[PDB]
Each structure stands twice: as structure tokens, then as C-alpha cells.
Scaffold this motif. Structure first.
Motif, PDB file in Angstrom:
ATOM      1  N   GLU A 168      -5.329  30.500   7.602  1.00  0.00           N
ATOM      2  CA  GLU A 168      -4.824  29.749   8.739  1.00  0.00           C
ATOM      3  C   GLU A 168      -4.585  28.364   8.081  1.00  0.00           C
ATOM      4  OE1 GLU A 168      -7.488  28.630  11.820  1.00  0.00           O
ATOM      5  OE2 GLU A 168      -5.897  28.290  13.363  1.00  0.00           O
ATOM      6  N   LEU A 169      -5.355  27.820   7.162  1.00  0.00           N
ATOM      7  CA  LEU A 169      -5.326  26.662   6.674  1.00  0.00           C
ATOM      8  C   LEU A 169      -4.251  26.336   5.492  1.00  0.00           C
ATOM      9  CD1 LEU A 169      -9.351  25.681   6.367  1.00  0.00           C
ATOM     10  CD2 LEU A 169      -7.562  24.852   7.797  1.00  0.00           C
ATOM     11  N   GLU A 170      -3.809  27.498   4.935  1.00  0.00           N
ATOM     12  CA  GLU A 170      -2.747  27.339   3.918  1.00  0.00           C
ATOM     13  C   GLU A 170      -1.307  27.721   4.310  1.00  0.00           C
ATOM     14  OE1 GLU A 170      -4.481  30.134   0.971  1.00  0.00           O
ATOM     15  OE2 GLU A 170      -6.035  28.487   0.124  1.00  0.00           O
ATOM     16  N   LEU A 173       0.767  23.442   5.147  1.00  0.00           N
ATOM     17  CA  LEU A 173      -0.068  22.751   4.729  1.00  0.00           C
ATOM     18  C   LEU A 173       0.173  21.319   5.418  1.00  0.00           C
ATOM     19  CD1 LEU A 173      -0.328  23.476   0.990  1.00  0.00           C
ATOM     20  CD2 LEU A 173      -2.156  23.959   2.632  1.00  0.00           C
ATOM     21  N   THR A 176      -1.264  21.860   8.680  1.00  0.00           N
ATOM     22  CA  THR A 176      -2.636  21.446   8.570  1.00  0.00           C
ATOM     23  C   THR A 176      -3.093  20.074   8.522  1.00  0.00           C
ATOM     24  OG1 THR A 176      -2.981  23.642   7.712  1.00  0.00           O
ATOM     25  CG2 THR A 176      -4.611  22.102   7.117  1.00  0.00           C
ATOM     26  N   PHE A 201      -6.140  26.255  14.781  1.00  0.00           N
ATOM     27  CA  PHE A 201      -4.432  25.625  15.184  1.00  0.00           C
ATOM     28  C   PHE A 201      -3.910  26.488  16.254  1.00  0.00           C
ATOM     29  CE2 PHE A 201      -4.944  23.848  10.518  1.00  0.00           C
ATOM     30  CZ  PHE A 201      -5.913  22.801  10.884  1.00  0.00           C
TER      31      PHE A 201
END
Ligand SMILES: Fc1ccc(CCNCc2ccc(Oc3ccccc3)cc2)cc1
Ligand SMILES: Fc1ccc(CCNCc2ccc(Oc3ccccc3)cc2)cc1
Lengths: 319, 319
Positions: A168-170, A173, A176, A201
């Protein structure tokens, strides 16, 4: 306040172990002040502090912590426990030929500088934490029990299993960091609906707006760095709760004797000011700062205020 | 005396111009002391001084000068004139956020720190040269006339045309450094029969012996570095005599006002002690050191003696 252009800095590299080298940015002369950022940040998170401290008469070393930026990101999860991280920072000082330094941290970095003060006070001239309090380890309370107690700490459960939060974080970006680096009043995240409804997110804008705290150029710098190693290394700072707990327990029954500063943020809704309520009993020489209207990203949110608190405290308790 | 293992050092990099970055090694806390080696050397030439100065309370920055080692080696010959070199060192200080530093040089490095003291005294806390004296530029004497005067300076004529000295110096690097890095009593070179009979090493052993000053391991470190950029960049420090002369002439009629140390070597048969005879008239606050039984490679030859002279002088005139 004066910030930093990354290419106009002096860059330092130190090898603390065979496949682990730490990167830092350096400016100024005078007593050594080591700055340790939090998750998911960078030495650049101190961009408003670095030129201010140097101008006040200090030699600033702003770290890329292990797993971040230009510092090495070893693959093993246990390389990111506090015991290993702190001894590498001791080796860091050794390689630079520094008998001691002032340590200033924020978020995970603030946890690290508290344990540097606790196990290596000989090497720490003075210690300061933003937001992160020092609570002594409870040898009767397992870490999972205490996380699954206060509901705001449930995002750390989502961070546990490798690969899940990384994805999810990558995935985008820019989304993010634009979603994370926001003032409290602009926040788009509910850090508690985390582990029973998708992720961090899932109910955030697909194209979030740009917080008043940051420009597009500063977002893209963070984006560029986390393209080097990704989010695994940074996430591994959360995946050693039980080892940090056992290590921290080996110190129970000792106070932190060195000069110390605790800075709380009124609108940090996770590391809330009240979590620091009784650090005086464990830290006799503790000074305090407190910043109104300040969320989690303290150095970006209220740069002038943090600069005044640190310089005021350095000139009276570190020199 | 304690030396340095290269991989156990902190390495710093600073960009002073678009395609030019300077590399240095850093150890210690306290006043900044910048060390500038000569031809054909390296920051490693200060290996016996770096831990000694740091232990005496100084923050040591040992340079890889431009053209050497890990520092950039631009191709243009004019990039190596003293005017450009000195302003890059000023930019270096700027990027590190240092209002001033002590400058200590040897050989070409000693020439550079003299001109740093002369044109940028504001940025030089104190200056020290080993072997290299400061003689004011004679605006009536061209550089070629003065070189072709004293016969020992004829190797600089062999160094002028690009490609010629590079070939002899690079053909076998182990032979080059084993032939150069020797005490005066072990010398295998006649620096005057240079330009009418072959070159520097034509009448030298093909497999020279290892000087008492060095081990094989230290030779191989120099060998490894000069495999990066070769000898062109280092040789270019000799190929701007006329520009250095005109630049130096623009300062005629001014003395060096800052604290200063001149260290002469009894057995340096090129930079002989007597060439420094009248620097007092141009440098009122000049202190002196003198080392018996010491050849050109002063830091390697008599490390204990140089350490005592520098520390004694730093503690009384730089702090
Ligand atoms: F919007 C955001 C974005 C990022 C964060 C990171 C905050 N996390 C820092 C931290 C500090 C101590 C920690 O140790 C524990 C572990 C369990 C219980 C109590 C303390 C664990 C994490 C917060 C809000
Ligand atoms: F065995 C060795 C190996 C290397 C060396 C290098 C010594 N060269 C340093 C230097 C210092 C000033 C210079 O400027 C001039 C130029 C013309 C006249 C007077 C001064 C030119 C070179 C010597 C002996």
C-alpha cells in the motif's frame, strides 16, 4: 525559515558493520548535535533546523537512519531492533572520533535517542525528543497486550506482517507522502479503522491535496529517496516489539541522569502530550517544551517554534 | 604512532562546482583543522597526524586534493591553477558551514595554504606549512627564468607538456611510489639530470627496495588510488606557473597577518630550509619548527616530531 537544498550540503558516510553504512548531512562548527528522524522520513525532515542550529554555534549531523535514503537497508527484520540500532550509533560516534554528542530525535528517532540516553549515557551529552515520550518497559505487560489496548495503535498491527503495508505504501509514493505529511486539521486518515477495513489509504483521496506544510518540490524529494530501498526497512522499525521489550526490561531500575528535553505537540493524536505525564520520576533533570497547534510532523509544522525551543535548551543545558 | 585503516574512517563529500566534488576524511571534535597533502600523495599521507590531532582536541578534515583519490579530476589544465583551487576550498568551507579553519599543508598543499592565508585570511584561523616556504611573487622575474635558474627545479620542466610525465609515472605504479617514498639516505633519484637524459626513473632500479618509511600495504594503497584518475590531474598542479605568477602578483604589497607556522626539513634537498630565510618580513606572527634527519616526505619520515610541533603550535596560537 531557511531550509536546505540537498545538493548544496556536505554528505558523510560511515561503515558501522560489514554491509551497513550510515549516511548523514553535516553543517556547522561547535558541539556535535545528532538528529534522528522518524517514520517515514529522512534527514530532510530537519531541513528547517539544520541551518538554524549551525547558525547558533552547533555542528549538526542529520542522519538518514538505517533503512532510509542513502543509508544501507539490510534485509533482515532483526537488524532494525533498538539494541542493534543503538550500538550502531555508538560505532558511528567511534568512527567519527566523537566522545559524545547531543541526540535529538522525533517519532521512532525519539525512541532511539531515549534508549541511547538510557544504555549509553556516557556517549550522550544531552538528549531531546519531539513527541515521543520515554515510558519504562513494563515486564508484566506483553507488547501485543498494550498495543491491542489503546485503539489508536492498531496501525502497528497492520505493519507487522512483511509485504502487506509495503504494497500500500509503495503503490503510489506521491499519494503516500501527500496523505501523511499534513497538519492535524487537514488529516485524511483514521489510524484506528486500519486493521478491520482495508488499510491506511483505503478511504483517502486518490489524488490528495497538497498540505499547507509542504510544496510539491519537497514531496518529490521524499518520493525520490523511498525509490531507493522502499518501505520494508522503515517498516521493520515496528516489527521488533517483543525484542525491544525484553531489551528494555534489562534496564529496569535505573534513571536517565543526563540533561534532557521533552517536547510535546498539542495536536499529535497518537503520541499525545499526556503519555509523557510522569517522565520526571525517571528523568530528574528533564526540561519541557510544548507547542500549540502542532500535529505529528512537528519540524515541518512549527519550524520556528521548535528552533527556538532547541536552541534555548542547547545554550543552557548542553554547552 | 597510531595510523589509519581507510575503511574505518568517516568519508565526506562536498560539491564545490558542477562537475567537481571534493572528498575528505574526518575525525574528532573541536576547532576545524584542514590538512592539504602534496604531489603525488593523498589524505593517507596524514595517517600519523589524523588520530594524533583528533586526540589533542581538534576536528580533522584530511583532503583528497583536486585530481587525487576520490576527489574529482576535471580534464582541463587551468582547473588546477591556484586561483581556482583556493576559491574551491573557500566554497568547501561554505558548504560545511565553517566560518574559518586552520589550514596545514605540505608540498603543493603548503603552497595552497599560504595563498589561502594571503587572499582569504578572513577564512583561515591559522596556517602551517611543512617544507613549502612562502616567497612573494617577483613581478620582474618570469617563472621560466627562475625555474631554469636553480638546477634542482628542472623536473618541473619535464612535467610541463601533457602526456610525457604521465607515461613514466603510470607505467608501473608500484615502482613509481617505491622510488619516490624514500628517506634522503635511500634516494634513487637525481632530480636535476631529469630533462637531458630520459626521465625521472631511467637510472633507478626496475624493482626498487622498500623504504624503511613504508610497508608494502601502504604502497599498495597509494597504488590503488592513482588507478582511479592517474597522474594527469596531480601533474596539472605544475602546469600553471605563469597564471599562478600573475595571480600572486595581484597581491604584492600585503603581509600575512594571521598566526602562522613554518616547518623546515633538514634533508629536503629541493625545498631546502634556507629558501624560507626571510618569511618573517612578510609574516610578522610567524613561528618556526625544524626537523633534523627529515627528507621531503616529512609526515611519513618523522611522524612523532611533526605531531609534537603541530599540537604544540595549535594549543598556543590556534585555540
Ligand atoms: F499519522 C501518523 C504517522 C506515523 C506515526 C508513527 C508513530 N509511531 C511512532 C512510535 C513510537 C513508539 C512506538 O513504540 C510503541 C509501541 C506500542 C505502544 C506504544 C509505543 C511505536 C511507534 C503516527 C501517526
Ligand atoms: F623527490 C621529490 C618529489 C616531489 C617533489 C615536489 C616538490 N614540488 C613542490 C613545489 C612547490 C612549489 C612550487 O612552485 C615553484 C615553482 C618554481 C620555483 C619555485 C617554486 C613548485 C613545486 C620534490 C622532490
Amino acid at each position: 525559515p531557511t531550509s536546505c537544498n540537498p545538493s548544496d550540503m556536505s554528505h558523510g558516510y560511515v561503515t558501522v558493520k560489514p554491509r551497513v553504512r550510515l549516511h548523514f548531512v553535516e553543517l556547522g562548527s561547535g558541539p556535535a548535535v545528532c538528529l534522528c528522524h522518524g517514520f517515514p522520513e529522512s534527514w530532510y525532515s530537519w531541513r528547517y533546523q539544520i541551518p538554524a542550529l549551525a547558525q547558533a554555534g552547533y555542528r549538526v549531523l542529520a542522519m538518514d537512519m538505517k533503512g532510509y535514503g542513502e543509508s544501507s537497508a539490510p534485509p533482515e527484520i532483526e537488524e532494525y531492533c533498538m539494541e542493534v540500532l543503538c550500538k550502531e550509533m555508538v560505532t558511528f560516534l567511534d568512527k567519527l572520533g566523537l566522545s559524545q554528542a547531543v541526540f535529538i530525535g522525533h517519532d521512532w528517532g525519539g525512541m532511539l535517542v531515549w534508549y541511547m540516553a538510557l544504555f549509553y549515557p556516557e556517549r550522550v551529552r544531552a538528549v531531546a525528543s519531539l513527541n515521543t515520550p520515554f515510558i519504562p518497559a513494563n515486564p508484566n505487560m506483553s507488547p501485543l497486550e498494550s498495543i491491542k489496548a489503546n485503539p489508536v495503535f492498531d496501525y502497528q498491527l497492520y505493519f507487522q506482517e512483511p509485504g502487506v503495508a509495503e504494497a500500500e505504501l509503495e503503490q503510489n509514493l506521491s499519494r503516500t507522502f501527500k496523505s501523511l505529511f499534513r497538519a492535524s486539521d487537514e488529516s485524511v486518515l483514521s489510524m484506528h479503522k486500519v486493521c478491520e477495513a482495508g488499510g491506511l489509504f483505503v478511504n483517502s483521496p486518490e489524488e490528495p491535496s497538497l498540505s499547507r506544510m509542504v510544496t510539491e518540490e519537497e514531496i518529490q524529494f521524499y518520493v525520490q529517496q523511498f525509490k531507493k530501498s522502499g518501505f520494508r526497512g522503515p517498516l521493520n522499525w515496528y516489527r521488533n516489539m517483543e525484542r525491544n521489550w525484553k531489551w528494555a526490561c534489562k534496564s529496569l531500575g535505573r534513571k536517565i541522569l543526563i540533561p534532557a528535553l521533552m517536547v510535546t505537540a498539542e495536536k499529535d493524536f497518537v503520541l499525545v502530550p499526556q503519555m509523557s505525564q510522569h517522565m520526571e520520576d525517571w528523568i530528574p533533570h528533564l526540561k519541557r517544551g510544548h507547542i500549540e497547534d502542532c500535529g505529528h510532523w512537528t519540524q515541518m509544522d512549527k519550524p520556528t517554534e521548535v528552533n527556538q525551543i532547541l536552541i534555548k535548551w542547547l545554550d543552557s543545558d548542553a554547552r
